[PDB]
Amino acid sequence: ATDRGSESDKHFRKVSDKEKIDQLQEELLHTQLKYQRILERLEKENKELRKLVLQKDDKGIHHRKLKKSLIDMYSEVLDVLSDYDASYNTQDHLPRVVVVGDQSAGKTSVLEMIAQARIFPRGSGEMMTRSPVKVTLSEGPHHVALFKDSSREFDLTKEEDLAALRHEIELRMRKNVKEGCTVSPETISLNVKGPGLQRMVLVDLPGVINTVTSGMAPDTKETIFSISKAYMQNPNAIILCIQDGSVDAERSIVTDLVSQMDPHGRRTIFVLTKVDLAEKNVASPSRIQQIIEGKLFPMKALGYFAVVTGKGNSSESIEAIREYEEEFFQNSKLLKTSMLKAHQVTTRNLSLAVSDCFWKMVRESVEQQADSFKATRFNLETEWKNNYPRLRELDRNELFEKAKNEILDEVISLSQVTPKHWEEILQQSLWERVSTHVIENIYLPAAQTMNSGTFNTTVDIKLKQWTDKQLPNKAVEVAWETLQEEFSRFMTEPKGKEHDDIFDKLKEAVKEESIKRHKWNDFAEDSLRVIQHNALEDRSISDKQQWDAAIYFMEEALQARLKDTENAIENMVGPDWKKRWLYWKNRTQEQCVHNETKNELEKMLKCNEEHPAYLASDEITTVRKNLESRGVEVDPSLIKDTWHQVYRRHFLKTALNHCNLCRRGFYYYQRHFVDSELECNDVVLFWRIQRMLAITANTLRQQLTNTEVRRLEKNVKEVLEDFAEDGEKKIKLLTGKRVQLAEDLKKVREIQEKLDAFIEALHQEK
Amino acid sequence: WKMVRESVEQQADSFKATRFNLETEWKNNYPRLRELDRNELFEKAKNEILD
Ligand SMILES: Nc1nc2c(ncn2[C@@H]2O[C@H](COP(=O)(O)OP(=O)(O)O)[C@@H](O)[C@H]2O)c(=O)[nH]1
Ligand code: ALF
Ligand SMILES: [K+]
Numbered sequence: 001a002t003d004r005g006s007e008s009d010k011h012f013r014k015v016s017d018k019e020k021i022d023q024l025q026e027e028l029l030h031t032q033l034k035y036q037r038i039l040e041r042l043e044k045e046n047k048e049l050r051k052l053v054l055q056k057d058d059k060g061i062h063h064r065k066l067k068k069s070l071i072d073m074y075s076e077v078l079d080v081l082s083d084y085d086a087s088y089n090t091q092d093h094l095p096r097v098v099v100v101g102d103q104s105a106g107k108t109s110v111l112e113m114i115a116q117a118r119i120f121p122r123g124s125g126e127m128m129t130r131s132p133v134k135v136t137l138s139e140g141p142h143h144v145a146l147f148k149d150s151s152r153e154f155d156l157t158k159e160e161d162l163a164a165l166r167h168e169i170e171l172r173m174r175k176n177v178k179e180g181c182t183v184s185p186e187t188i189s190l191n192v193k194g195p196g197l198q199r200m201v202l203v204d205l206p207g208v209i210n211t212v213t214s215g216m217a218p219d220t221k222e223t224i225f226s227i228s229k230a231y232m233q234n235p236n237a238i239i240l241c242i243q244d245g246s247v248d249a250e251r252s253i254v255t256d257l258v259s260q261m262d263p264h265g266r267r268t269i270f271v272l273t274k275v276d277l278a279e280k281n282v283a284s285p286s287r288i289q290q291i292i293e294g295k296l297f298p299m300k301a302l303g304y305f306a307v308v309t310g311k312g313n314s315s316e317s318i319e320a321i322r323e324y325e326e327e328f329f330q331n332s333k334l335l336k337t338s339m340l341k342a343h344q345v346t347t348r349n350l351s352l353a354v355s356d357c358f359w360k361m362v363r364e365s366v367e368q369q370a371d372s373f374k375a376t377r378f379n380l381e382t383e384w385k386n387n388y389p390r391l392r393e394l395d396r397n398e399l400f401e402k403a404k405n406e407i408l409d410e411v412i413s414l415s416q417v418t419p420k421h422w423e424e425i426l427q428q429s430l431w432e433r434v435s436t437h438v439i440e441n442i443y444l445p446a447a448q449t450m451n452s453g454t455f456n457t458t459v460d461i462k463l464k465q466w467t468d469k470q471l472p473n474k475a476v477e478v479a480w481e482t483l484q485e486e487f488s489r490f491m492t493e494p495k496g497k498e499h500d501d502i503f504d505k506l507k508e509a510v511k512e513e514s515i516k517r518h519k520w521n522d523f524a525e526d527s528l529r530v531i532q533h534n535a536l537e538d539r540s541i542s543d544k545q546q547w548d549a550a551i552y553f554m555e556e557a558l559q560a561r562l563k564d565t566e567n568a569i570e571n572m573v574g575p576d577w578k579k580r581w582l583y584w585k586n587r588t589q590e591q592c593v594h595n596e597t598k599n600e601l602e603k604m605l606k607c608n609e610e611h612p613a614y615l616a617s618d619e620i621t622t623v624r625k626n627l628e629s630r631g632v633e634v635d636p637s638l639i640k641d642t643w644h645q646v647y648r649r650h651f652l653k654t655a656l657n658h659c660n661l662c663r664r665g666f667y668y669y670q671r672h673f674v675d676s677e678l679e680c681n682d683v684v685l686f687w688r689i690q691r692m693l694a695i696t697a698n699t700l701r702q703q704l705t706n707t708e709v710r711r712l713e714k715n716v717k718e719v720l721e722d723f724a725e726d727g728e729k730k731i732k733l734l735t736g737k738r739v740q741l742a743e744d745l746k747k748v749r750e751i752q753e754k755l756d757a758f759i760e761a762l763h764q765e766k
Numbered sequence: 767w768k769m770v771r772e773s774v775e776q777q778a779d780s781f782k783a784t785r786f787n788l789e790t791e792w793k794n795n796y797p798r799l800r801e802l803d804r805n806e807l808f809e810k811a812k813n814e815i816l817d
């Protein structure tokens with residue numbers, strides 16, 4: 001009878017097994033223990049069956065050391081790195097090839113005529129590049145590129161598919177840009193296969209703008225510079241410097257961006273675009289001869305200075321661009337009358353030369369990263385472990401689940417609270433809430449008559465009306481709060497000096513959802529009304545012990561009121577001579593008035609001890625004249641306020657003296673046959689309420705332990721499952737700086753594997 | 767029929783548990799009457815009154 005919710009769950013839980021254990025045992029334990037093992041061993045077979053078919057498309061199985069997915073290893077390493085750390089602290093050490101040049105140059109053309117002319121939005125009229133776009137190029141058949149690493153199935157040779165693919169990239173480009181600028185560092189990941197593509201990662205960084213026009217947000221050019229740090233602070237970056245062939249080199253921006261990155265040109269190759277505009281204006285090949293020699297290019301870029309040319313139409317196909325480029329370069333005086341042989345100028349030579357320089361840098365520098373990340377992990381683990389010796393290995397998934405079980409365990413522990421605590425806490429809390437209402441609004445005005453029948457009649461009518469409207473509504477609220485008060489203590493209270501504060505955000509977050517769903521039984525009040533009516537209706541106290549308990553607790557309530565009034569009075573009247581002379585204090589003129597106003601009222605009560613609480617205006621006038629006769633002029637309102645506090649002090653002392661004789665007078669045996677005027681009807685009123693609330697608490701406790709705590713437990717389970725799925729809150733709640741460090745350690749460990757996997761793939765040559 | 771077959775078996779356990787809890791308390795408070803009915807109660811009075 002102490003608790004019934006736990007028994008119900010066990011009974012039906014066994015029933016479920018009795019009917020379905022022959023299916024549950026296989027699914028719940030046998031399958032799950034083998035499930036993890038088969039992931040390593042049997043999924044291996046299905047992965048290999050498809051992988052081999054995919055490798056045949058790659059040709060990796062057919063040809064040793066030659067596989068189109070071999071270059072995809074390089075991108076996988078960077079994809080983890082960008083997710084692990086997209087900031088300069090990690091990005092600055094990641095090898096890459098970047099397209100750098102004046103925005104007007106159309107610098108991206110170096111990549112458009114390879115694969116991107118079909119799927120990347122282009123054309124003049126507006127700035128196209130909005131954020132760094134990385135394209136993973138690989139020798140292979142035509143295949144729809146990955147867009148934001150998302151799979152696609154499109155034909156790259158038909159306009160209808162390509163147009164939709166151009167839309168997809170544009171959406172990422174603009175969405176990466178936030179208010180205040182037109183460019184964003186947030187990168188876009190593309191991976192395309194097709195003929196003529198080289199194994200390398202080329203990034204089209206947003207074009208630099210000398211000045212921010214009114215058509216662009218003010219921070220455009222500063223943002224591009226910060227994005228330009230992808231190479232300016234990256235010793236592993238290869239820079240393709242694009243000179244806008246429409247304008248002279250002395251008008252360029254790229255010269256300063258790269259010359260401050262590598263003034264020796266060791267990390268860069270200079271490329272020129274739109275050279276054919278030289279013949280749409282008065283061509284000056286003598287300036288081109290300086291261009292090839294790098295006289296006017298401070299970065300002294302190394303390699304052959306390739307040139308890109310195009311019809312300028314934004315619909316020219318990749319094949320059309322290649323054919324146009326070859327014919328123009330092989331005949332134009334810009335290159336035929338200067339030392340720029342077309343077979344070195346052609347973009348396809350740049351793609352090969354860029355691919356050649358790409359693998360040179362990657363193999364040389366990649367091994368340094370493996371040592372760097374390993375050193376990082378050891379330094380992080382040493383400090384992380386020393387500050388958190390308890391957690392040698394931690395994850396945010398492990399952190400959440402521990403709380404999930406811990407929370408459910410505590411709420412169950414809350415369900416283990418004995419009724420003794422519930423009944424005492426509910427009874428004590430509820431009575432204290434309504435202890436003054438009865439005294440001030442029911443008892444004291446009823447005490448103004450000497451007719452005990454009216455006294456009991458008056459209160460009973462008020463109580464029944466009060467009972468119907470207030471008592472069960474306050475009682476449930478106390479019970480609802482009382483359960484939450486213990487729940488919070490069970491939930492988030494520390495175990496002395498040991499406490500995992502890392503879990504407090506989730507615990508309180510779970511509570512708020514669980515209390516919102518904690519709807520107390522809407523009919524609990526109806527039972528209490530019947531109970532309270534019966535508890536009040538039965539006023540028969542035939543037991544001395546019932547009398548003894550009721551009177552002592554009534555005294556405490558009255559003594560509390562007496563001190564409450566007395567403390568208010570002392571402030572109203574101030575210190576007496578004992579404290580005025582002891583602490584060198586004095587009275588305010590109001591306190592002086594109150595003391596004399598008190599004295600006159602005390603004298604009035606000294607004789608008229610039975611004076612009713614209500615004062616006649618003649619008494620108010622009499623006091624005023626009695627005080628005015630001593631030089632004290634008092635507003636009637638002061639007297640009435642003084643009167644109320646002093647009267648209760650007078651009354652309450654009388655009531656306690658009545659209580660003293662009620663217990664003592666009846667206690668003496670020979671006095672029980674003396675019918676004195678000591679009808680302790682207040683003890684009858686107090687006793688019934690004490691019993692009435694005690695029964696109320698028991699009804700609340702029964703509902704508390706039978707229905708409400710189970711609803712609280714059920715809601716917690718519903719909320720915790722929502723949190724289990726709510727990754728963002730789990731991240732937002734689990735921010736303890738050790739799980740985040742543990743998360744970083746995991747990512748570092750993964751990168752070390754990914755770094756070595758690619759490095760291991762480099763070592764396939766020997 | 768999906769809901770009825772799934773949940774109906776729970777009722778059988780619930781009612782059986784109800785009877786055992788009711789019989790335990792009912793029998794303990796009324797050990798004399800292991801089985802009682804309002805028809806048996808009336809007839810006993812009928813004979814008792816006539817006697
Ligand atoms: N004349 C000429 N036009 C080009 C060349 N490369 C690209 N374009 C034109 O520039 C426009 C878009 O090229 P794109 O590489 O996207 O430059 P961006 O949009 O300014 O970054 C298209 O209309 C192309 O025809 C080139 O080498 N010569
Ligand atoms: F014109 Al650009 F990136 F070269 F928008
Ligand atoms: K442009």
Ligand SMILES: [Mg+2]
Nearest residue numbers: 108122128129
């Ligand atoms: Mg562009």
